[PDB]
């Protein structure tokens, strides 16, 4: 008799994005038990009796365990829900543990080799099994439990008809003696899916609606798959569920008495607008950077008031392509420098956004207000550790002079942060992976003094507005002053040189607008004159 | 049998100022239990099984939870009051957790998909659901409880007849794995109301008095709503209670044996003088403002001894108008400077007072004597954090050089 139910199909279990992991598990675990026996006896090997699964929350471990349990033709599996073995008396936890293996031992002793398979599932295994000798209190029972489990899994007596599956979120807290080969060999990591996995998952959860003609014809799955970045399976299911409810709510009246139409309920359909609305107000991923960050960093957009704006972007694209393609230089760096109120952070954010890399992050000092020095170092190390895990990554470090506390008097600064940054600017990631680093500052000479400007590969200058023509172009692009008033403005600026930053012009205009209609251009010109110049 | 009670009515709940939040909760939680069952079957979706509510004190979380409990035709809800499940014997705190899900599992096994609804309420959830240490040697004091709860809400065995509601004041300490879209999917914030909500709350709490002609005719509720700026739900109720107590106290005499005059107690009525007295002495808000501080900082008033006094105030008016009527610049700052004893801290106080913004706070070094730099930074962060929960805020920083601990010798200061 085979160990697989005759009516089993891989597409029946409804799992998507884990083809490789399932293939590896099947190869390592069930290969021996399906192959003809005589060759196995000649070959003389022992079966494998251990599987461990780990990963971040909401990726599909329990689903794999349940589906594997359903696949095999054997006895009903035994499941342990967390720390359900602990007892108040003495020696009862060990008895509870021993009571799990009774049937397997009995069958092994009776029928010998020709025996069935027994499956045992441990959920949240890190609750009961931890490294021995680490608990200050109540450790008398925990160590005994661990020792009993170790002895039972692999002891003087030998069993050959048991399989053990474990799931955990903290793989590094488990006892090492439990992870050696012969006890728990197949160790698997379940991570976030890629675009193809997201597309497969999205297709899985929309089959019934399509089959029953409840899905509108204007919904494109590929657009959703492209848009939904950094999502996990649970989040995709939640998005679909919210979209379904937004449609059901249009046929209910909860004003005074809850009433349903029941005459328009028929012909219920789900449209693209429901998906869009559910994606902006209901579900939000818990990983990486998203739109709410770019909205804050780039508040007033980008306007082409001159030539240098295109020059900076065309210079950043060359570096993005170089990091993407080349293989002799896996690590690249660049420094954007310019005078104050020039708009460096916005340009850096725009370049990072158009990079289109899978992983993007922004490290800014405004998220670490009041922190000490070690806290700053540790918070930077964490952001740099998560880019090593990915394949190709981009990182942004803005306002360096504020990251390390610099003040002209003294001078005074944090040496620890400086040393950490100098170390991290020349550290390469593991083989086959690539990283881009962008940094912004407003004081080049200070960085030169500390010998940091030679740890960067290249620099890009961000200039200010220098001529009246550019000022008039910016005013026209903003559309704040009419042609009649712009004529008067041009009558004054064309015969002079200007020196102003973009971020200051938007404040000057707002200050001017408060005056009465007659005294607006006059106030604006007075403020501009007061600003002066110092190229 | 319908899930909703036959006689339920929204106006009967008695909650005002939260019409959008309740609509969202209803849509996301109860939409799929009211629609016809066959169509829901065809779609093949599962029900939601979690709600979380967070916000500052006194804004109506426990009232909403209780009303939601009373609006459903189901069993009697189970209630847990804080850390009521902790025990000293090994392995009992988790048996207590597992004992809350027995009935639901039994009914699911027996009746299948025709079961009722079982509700569970966790008051002060942050007391027993903190983040797990996840690093060897600082294992949390209670992690077995967290693991048991996680395993029971969503485990290898599937339930479809439960609903869990939680409440907290510090939403940033909860374990992340507990808040994923499969366990506690709907998260809501309950914040301070606006003028319309204040009017609605006052009407709710005055309806009964108005029924029996116990309220005088010179009381206007719109004026009261206008006056009470940045009041939480509880403070309005306290104000009404204080007014009623003041009204009642006039017909009692307690300096000797206690006697009640039951001949003029039948002509009892509540006047606006009681409300005015209550607004001045009894109730003091927390996110609002009070006139005592201005009297503390403008001790001797402001006299117009020349022209500059007018220019300084006109510039402040202009800046206030700009900050209130602007969209491209949501943040503006200004600095007042001059020689010593010139009176610059009173002018700033006067400008802030005349701004007429709902939220006005003053940060002064008088309250930070002997503090280390870390405590001073923490206090400043607290004030600025409180200032971000209002639609219009004004903040004043006074004596910057005494805040930095500057001394000409050296010089020395706090970086």
């Amino acid at each position: 008799q085979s160990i697989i139910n005759p009516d089993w199909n891989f597409e029946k279990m409804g799992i998507g994005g884990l083809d490789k992991e399932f293939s590896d598990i099947f190869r390592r675990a069930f290969a021996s038990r399906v192959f003809p026996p005589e060759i196995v006896e000649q070959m003389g090997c022992k079966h494998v009796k251990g599987i461990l699964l780990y990963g971040p929350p909401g990726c599909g471990k329990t689903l794999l365990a349940r589906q594997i349990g359903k696949m095999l033709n054997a006895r009903e599996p035994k499941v342990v829900n967390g720390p359900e073995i602990l007892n108040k008396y003495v020696g009862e936890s060990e008895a509870n543990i021993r009571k799990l293996f009774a049937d397997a031992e009995e069958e092994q002793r009776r029928l010998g080799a020709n025996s069935g398979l027994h499956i045992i599932i441990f959920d949240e295994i890190d609750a009961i099994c931890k490294q021995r000798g680490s608990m200050a209190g109540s450790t008398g029972v925990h160590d005994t439990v661990v020792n009993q489990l170790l002895s039972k899994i692999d002891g003087v007596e030998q069993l050959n008809n048991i399989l053990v599956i474990g799931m955990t979120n903290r793989p590094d807290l488990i006892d090492e003696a439990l992870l050696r080969p012969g006890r728990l060999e197949v160790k698997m990591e379940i991570g976030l899916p890629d675009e193809k996995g997201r597309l497969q998952i999205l297709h899985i959860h929309t089959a019934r609606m399509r089959g029953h003609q409840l899905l509108s014809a204007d919904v494109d799955i590929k657009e959703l798959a492209v848009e939904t970045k950094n999502f996990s399976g649970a989040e995709l299911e939640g998005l679909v569920r919210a979209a379904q409810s937004t449609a059901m709510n249009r046929h209910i009246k909860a004003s005074t008495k809850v009433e349903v139409d029941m005459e328009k309920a028929e012909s219920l359909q789900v449209t693209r607008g429901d998906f869009l609305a559910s994606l902006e107000n209901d579900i939000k991923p818990a990983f990486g950077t998203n739109q709410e960050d770019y909205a804050s960093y780039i508040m007033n957009g980008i306007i082409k008031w001159g030539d240098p704006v295109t020059r900076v972007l065309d210079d950043g694209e060359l570096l993005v392509q170089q990091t993407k393609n080349s293989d002799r230089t896996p690590l690249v760096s660049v420094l954007l420098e310019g005078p104050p109120h020039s708009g460096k952070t916005a340009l850096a954010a725009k370049i990072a956004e158009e990079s289109n890399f899978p992983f993007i992050k922004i490290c800014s000092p405004d998220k670490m207000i009041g922190f000490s020095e070690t806290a700053k170092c540790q918070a930077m190390k964490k952001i740099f550790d998560d880019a090593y895990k990915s394949q190709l990554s981009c990182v942004v470090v803005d306002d360096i002079e504020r990251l390390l506390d610099y003040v002209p008097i003294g001078p005074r600064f944090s040496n620890l942060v400086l040393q950490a940054l100098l170390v991290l600017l020349k550290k390469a990631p593991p083989q086959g992976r690539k990283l881009l680093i962008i940094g912004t500052t407003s004081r080049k000479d200070v960085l030169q003094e500390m010998e940091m400007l030679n740890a960067f590969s290249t620099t890009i200058h961000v200039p200010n507005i220098a001529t009246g023509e550019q000022l008039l172009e910016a005013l026209e692009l903003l559309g704040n002053f009419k042609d009649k008033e712009r004529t008067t403005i041009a009558q004054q600026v064309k015969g002079k040189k200007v020196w102003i930053g973009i971020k200051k012009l938007l404040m000057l205009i707002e200050m001017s607008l408060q005056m009465d209609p007659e005294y607006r251009v006059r106030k604006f010109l007075a403020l501009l004159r007061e600003e002066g110049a110092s190229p | 049998q319908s899930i909703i009670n036959p006689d339920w009515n929204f106006e009967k709940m008695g909650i005002g100022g939260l019409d959008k939040e309740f609509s969202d909760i209803f849509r996301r939680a109860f939409a799929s239990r009211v629609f016809p069952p066959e169509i829901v079957e065809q779609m093949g979706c599962k029900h939601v099984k979690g709600i979380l509510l967070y916000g500052p004190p006194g804004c109506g979380k426990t009232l909403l939870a209780r009303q939601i409990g009373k609006m459903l035709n189901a069993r009697e809800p189970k209630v847990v009051n804080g850390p009521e499940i902790l025990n000293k014997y090994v392995g009992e705190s988790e048996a207590n957790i597992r004992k809350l899900f027995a009935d639901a599992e039994e009914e699911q096994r027996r009746l299948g998909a025709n079961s009722g609804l079982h509700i569970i309420i966790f008051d002060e959830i942050d007391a027993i659901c903190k983040q797990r240490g996840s690093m060897a040697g600082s294992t949390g004091v209670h992690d077995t409880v967290v693991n048991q709860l996680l395993s029971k809400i969503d485990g290898v065995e599937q339930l479809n007849n439960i609903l869990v509601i939680g409440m907290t004041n510090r939403p940033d300490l909860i374990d992340e794995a507990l808040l994923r879209p499969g366990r506690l999917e709907v998260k809501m914030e309950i914040g301070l109301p606006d003028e319309k909500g204040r009017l609605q709350i006052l009407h709710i709490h005055t309806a009964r008095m108005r029924g029996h002609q116990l309220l005088s005719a010179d009381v206007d509720i719109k004026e009261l709503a206008v006056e009470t700026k940045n009041f939480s739900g509880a403070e309005l109720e306290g104000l009404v209670r204080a007014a009623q107590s003041t009204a009642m106290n006039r017909h009692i005499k307690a300096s000797t044996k206690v006697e009640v005059d039951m001949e003029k107690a039948e002509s009892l009525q509540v006047t606006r003088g009681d409300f005015l007295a209550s607004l001045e002495n009894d109730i003091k808000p927390a996110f609002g403002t009070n006139q005592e501080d201005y009297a503390s900082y403008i001790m001797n008033g402001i006299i117009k001894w020349g022209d500059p006094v007018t220019r300084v105030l006109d510039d402040g008016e202009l800046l206030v108008q700009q900050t209130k009527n602007s969209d491209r610049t949501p943040l503006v700052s200004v600095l007042l400077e001059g020689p010593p004893h010139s009176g610059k801290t009173a002018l700033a106080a006067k400008i802030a007072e005349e701004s007429n913004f709902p939220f006005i706070k003053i940060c002064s070094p008088d309250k930070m004597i002997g503090f280390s730099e870390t405590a001073k930074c923490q206090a400043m962060k607290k004030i600025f954090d409180d200032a971000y929960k209002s639609q219009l805020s004004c903040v004043v920083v006074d004596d910057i050089e005494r805040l930095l601990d500057y001394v000409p010798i050296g010089p020395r200061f706090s970086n």
Binding site: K88, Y89, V90, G137, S138, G140, V141 | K88, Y89, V90, V141
Partner: peptide
């Protein structure tokens, strides 16, 4: 000095 935290307890059963 921070006072020592709380502790669990273990129990022993007797037969009459």
């Amino acid at each position: 000095m921070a006072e020592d935290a709380d502790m669990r307890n273990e129990l022993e059963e007797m037969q009459r």
